[PDB]
Amino acid sequence: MPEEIPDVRKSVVVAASVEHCFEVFTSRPADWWPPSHVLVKKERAGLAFEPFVGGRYYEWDIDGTEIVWGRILEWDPPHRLAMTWRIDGHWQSVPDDDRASEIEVDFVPNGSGGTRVELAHVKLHRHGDGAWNIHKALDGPSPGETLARFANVI
Numbered sequence: 001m002p003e004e005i006p007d008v009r010k011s012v013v014v015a016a017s018v019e020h021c022f023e024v025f026t027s028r029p030a031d032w033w034p035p036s037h038v039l040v041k042k043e044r045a046g047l048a049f050e051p052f053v054g055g056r057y058y059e060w061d062i063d064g065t066e067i068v069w070g071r072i073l074e075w076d077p078p079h080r081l082a083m084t085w086r087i088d089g090h091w092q093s094v095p096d097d098d099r100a101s102e103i104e105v106d107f108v109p110n111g112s113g114g115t116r117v118e119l120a121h122v123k124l125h126r127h128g129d130g131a132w133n134i135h136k137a138l139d140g141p142s143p144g145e146t147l148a149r150f151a152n153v154i
């Protein structure tokens with residue numbers, strides 16, 4: 001959980017379908033952020049999700065109004081898609097991010113309810129200045145990595 005976010009690439013297979021992987025993201029990504037063992041500093045309130053290229057996802061915080069914490073780049077019909085993240089230093093959305101980075105993500109459907117996902121983020125440090133702090137509100141726990149909470153619920 002370093003304050004700086006250098007380029008890192010990790011991937012794992014979870015029991016889920018690529019369409020399902022995104023159904024959860026566009027269905028209720030905040031509802032599972034907080035499982036129980038780990039608590040979130042801010043309570044998620046609502047979430048807006050629409051499909052498209054250069055897309056955007058919005059999260060509602062009881063203390064934070066509606067804002068965009070991520071972005072998209074393009075969707076590949078099969079099961080592959082690249083996405084960009086749109087966020088500001090104070091969790092605010094802006095017409096364009098000078099410190100924006102590109103992320104490459106690919107999904108592969110595996111029968112028996114299994115999906116392989118490869119998510120890699122590079123040049124993220126472009127935001128620096130407490131960059132992880134921004135992610136910290138989004139919850140960046142180490143003991144309960146993202147694969148632990150979101151994969152188990154899926």
Ligand SMILES: CC[C@](C)(O)c1cc(=O)c2c(C)cc3c(c2o1)C(=O)c1c(O)cccc1C3=O
Pocket residue numbers: 008009010011012013014116117118119120121140141142144145146147148150151
């Ligand atoms: C501490 C948060 C974590 C898990 O290290 C993290 C941080 C990550 O940077 C991260 C990266 C690099 C890749 C994945 C994932 C990544 O998530 C990831 O969570 C993931 C997943 O939950 C299910 C399928 C695939 C993935 C990933 O490919």
